[PDB]
Amino acid sequence: KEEASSKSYRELIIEGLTALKERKGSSRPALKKFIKENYPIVGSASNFDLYFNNAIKKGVEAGDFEQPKGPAGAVKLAKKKSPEVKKEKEVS
């Protein structure tokens, strides 16, 4: 709005993660690019690459994102804690 930041990664990730899901979901690097191309505000933010990882972690604990391929893999928009997601090791 004025500051060159203060974009919620929650919005940014979901905006993409819902779109670039393809087969079902997509890895962080793909989302990171999506945000950089679409939301330069945060995309070109210092240590955005690092912040994004924490954002994913924050989102998955919040039950807003979920990683089918376990932590540090592909993320998928979480809507229901449905079965056949037993490749996350310990995202809990």
Swiss-Prot record:
Record keywords: Chromosome, DNA-binding, Nucleus, Phosphoprotein, Repeat
Signal peptide: none
GO molecular function annotation: chromatin DNA binding; DNA binding; double-stranded DNA binding; molecular adaptor activity; nucleic acid binding; nucleosomal DNA binding; phosphate ion binding; structural constituent of chromatin
Highest taxon of the lineage: Eukaryota
Cellular component aspect of the GO annotation: chromatin; nucleosome; nucleus; protein-DNA complex
Biased composition (Basic and acidic residues): 81-92
Keyword ATP-binding carried by entry: no
Compartments, as annotated in UniProt: Nucleus; Chromosome
GO BP field: chromosome condensation; negative regulation of DNA recombination; nucleosome assembly; regulation of DNA-templated transcription; regulation of double-strand break repair; sporulation
Every H15 domain range: 5-79
Extra information: Present with 6560 molecules/cell in log phase SD medium.
Function summary: Could act as an H1-type linker histone. Has been shown to bind DNA.
Family classification: Belongs to the histone H1/H5 family.
Protein name as catalogued: Histone H1
Species per Swiss-Prot/TrEMBL record: Saccharomyces cerevisiae (strain ATCC 204508 / S288c)
